[PDB]
């Protein structure tokens, strides 16, 4: 299973962010508002969660062979991931997620504060003009082979377009001492 593919728990669905390593042990990063739901996922057991404030969580794979260090492009191909980086305003990016597949756009702001009402407030989010829909959360924000973020939320949809916010992946990697595969 690669970045952007579906991960579920009971009736809930999110998308996988990035497969990572923690001291050689395979894990998967996804959104914290997703891992807050349950400790038991289709791919394994949750070992960390942070939402709101942040929006990241990590799951240890039950099957280490499934930790595919790529992003699925929803066209039968995959993008290889080799590093993690920080986004910059004006950067051309792509997002992969299980509801809408692959979409592209550009970064329009950094360190945005996002109020999700009853769900709380998240800080320091990457802002983009890429569309997303429910189910896309936790999925991959990347530029070529560089991992940049995890889908958190936004407004609109993929027919009318909208604004989306992402948790910077470097903060999630350092929280857990993880490195992207």
């Amino acid at each position: 299973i690669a970045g952007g593919e579906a991960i579920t728990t009971g009736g809930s669905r999110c998308s996988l962010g990035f497969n990572v390593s923690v001291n050689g042990v395979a894990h998967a990063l996804t959104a914290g508002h997703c891992t807050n739901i349950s400790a038991s996922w289709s791919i394994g057991t949750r070992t960390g969660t942070s939402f709101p404030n942040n929006d990241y969580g990590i799951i240890r794979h039950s099957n280490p062979a499934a930790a595919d260090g790529r992003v699925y492009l929803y066209n039968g191909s995959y993008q290889d991931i080799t590093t993690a980086g920080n986004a910059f305003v004006g950067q051309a990016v792509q997002r992969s997620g299980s509801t809408t597949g692959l979409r592209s756009g550009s970064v329009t702001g950094l360190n945005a504060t996002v109020n999700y009402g009853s769900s709380g407030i998240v800080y320091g989010m990457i802002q983009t003009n890429v569309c997303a829909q429910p189910g896309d959360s936790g999925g991959s924000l990347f530029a070529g082979s560089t991992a940049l973020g995890l889908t958190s939320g936004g407004s609109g949809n993929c027919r009318t377009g909208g604004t989306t916010f992402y948790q910077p992946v470097t903060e999630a990697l350092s929280a857990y001492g993880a490195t992207v595969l």
Binding site: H33, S119, G135
Partner: peptide, 4 residues
């Protein structure tokens, strides 16, 4: 905005 809302969580996806």
């Amino acid at each position: 905005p809302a969580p996806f």
